[PDB]
């Protein structure tokens, strides 16, 4: 099919770009995958460097690639605007790309997923907390927990070094409260979360794996210290999968740095296309 830029998709004061890949083999009622790029990247760049456009020709979903407006290409995952439901930041623009696409293509709103890598993984967690209503499931490749990049001076697209270096450590309860405040009083459904992180990540250090799993455990009321199951060498040698429940699993990749390589077929399974 083709990658098209869309410029009028709804309110977008932070000027995020929107690109979509509409497959040739478009399903009758297509799903949506939102695939969110890393720093120094762009939406078309992530299109070029991820399996989603290929998989969309198999499964017939539309892929949305949001594109950062900021110098350096990171996502704003620090401002109040981006860290609040309807706050008007980058995350709100991404939400609007979703709803534009659902209406324009008759996409199935119950089959909308979000995934990303590095900065886009940070944004994935933020999308899950700020627009939980939009997403059935999410897959995070090497990010930080929602609100870990909080700026204590309301900076937009600010890098939080304390968080990245793994110095921010707290309880499931505290992280859950932080995620909950991104949509205060929301009690509806939330996407099922899958969190990947590598053990030799020297950009977003591995403590962030545990902080993120703590967060979603706290959000879904799972006992962080008592997972349901742990699967060795799953999905492959030196990856370990911890399942806390239907709405949370973490995959820790020993010997892997920034970022954990996208596992496209595994994504299709978690989302439910496969």
Ligand X SMILES: *[C@@H]1O[C@H](CO)[C@@H](O[C@@H]2O[C@H](CO)[C@@H](O)[C@H](O)[C@H]2NC(C)=O)[C@H](O)[C@H]1NC(C)=O
Question: Looking at 79, 91, 93, 118, which residue is catalytic?
Answer: 118
Distance CA 104, CA 26 (A): 13
Piece of 67-75, 153-161, 182-190, 218-226 that binds a second copy (CB under 8 A) = 182-190
Name which position in 5, 54, 104, 238 contacts a second copy (CB under 8 A).
104
Distance CA 80, CA 195 (A): 24
Name which position in 54, 86, 154, 233 contacts a second copy (CB under 8 A).
86
Q: What is the widest separation between alpha-carbon atoms in the chain?
A: 47
Contacts of 219 (CB under 8 A, 6+ apart): 175, 176, 179, 180, 190
Please indicate whether residue 118 is annotated as part of the active site: yes
Name which position in 100, 141, 222, 239 contacts a second copy (CB under 8 A).
100
User: Smallest distance from the beta carbon of 129 to a second copy, in angstroms?
Assistant: 13
- Starting from the edge strand earliest in sequence, which strands make up the sheet with 137-141, in order? 2-5, 17-22, 62-67, 32-36, 112-117, 137-141, 192-198, 248-253, 239-245, 229-231
The interface partner of residue 234, options being a second copy, ligand X, Na ion, none and the CB cut-off 5 to 8 Å by kind, is none
The interface partner of residue 221, options being ligand X, a second copy, Na ion, none and the CB cut-off 5 to 8 Å by kind, is none
**Phi and psi based region of residue 260 (left: phi greater than 0; alpha: psi -120 to 50; beta: remaining):** beta
**Contact flag: residue 29 with Na ion (CB under 5 A):** yes
Q: Using CB under 6 A, list all residues that contact ligand X.
A: 148, 150-152, 160, 162-163, 168, 170, 174, 178
CB neighbours of residue 203 within 10 Å: 16
The interface partner of residue 50, options being ligand X, a second copy, Na ion, none and the CB cut-off 5 to 8 Å by kind, is Na ion
**Contact flag: residue 199 with a second copy (CB under 8 A):** no
For 66, the 3-state DSSP assignment is strand
Give me the active site residues, please. 118
């Amino acid at each position: 099919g083709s990658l098209q830029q869309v410029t009028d998709f709804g309110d977008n004061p932070t000027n995020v770009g929107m690109y979509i890949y509409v497959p040739n083999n478009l399903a009758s009622n297509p799903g949506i995958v939102v695939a969110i790029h890393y720093c120094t990247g762009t939406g078309p760049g992530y299109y070029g460097d991820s399996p989603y456009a290929t998989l969309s020709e198999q499964y017939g979903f539309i892929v949305i690639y949001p594109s950062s407006p900021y110098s350096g290409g990171c996502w704003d995952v620090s401002s109040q605007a981006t860290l609040t439901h309807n706050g008007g930041g980058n995350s709100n623009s991404i939400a609007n790309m979703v709803t534009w696409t659902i209406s324009k293509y008759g996409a199935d709103s119950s089959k909308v997923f979000v995934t990303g890598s590095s900065s886009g993984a940070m944004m994935t967690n933020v999308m899950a907390a700020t627009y939980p209503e939009l997403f059935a499931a999410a897959t995070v490749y090497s990010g930080v927990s929602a609100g870990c990049f909080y700026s204590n001076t309301n900076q937009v697209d600010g890098w939080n070094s304390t968080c990245a270096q793994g110095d921010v450590i707290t309880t499931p309860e505290h992280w859950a409260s932080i995620a909950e405040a991104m949509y205060s009083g929301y009690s509806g459904s939330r996407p099922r979360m899958q969190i990947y992180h590598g053990s030799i990540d020297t950009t977003l250090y591995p403590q962030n794996y545990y902080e993120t799993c703590k967060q979603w455990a706290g959000v879904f009321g799972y006992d962080y210290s008592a997972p349901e199951k742990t699967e060795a060498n799953t999905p492959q040698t030196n990856y370990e999968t911890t399942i806390w429940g239907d709405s949370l699993q973490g995959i820790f990749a020993t010997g892997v740095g920034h970022t954990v390589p996208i596992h496209g077929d595994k994504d299709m399974e978690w989302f439910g296309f496969a």
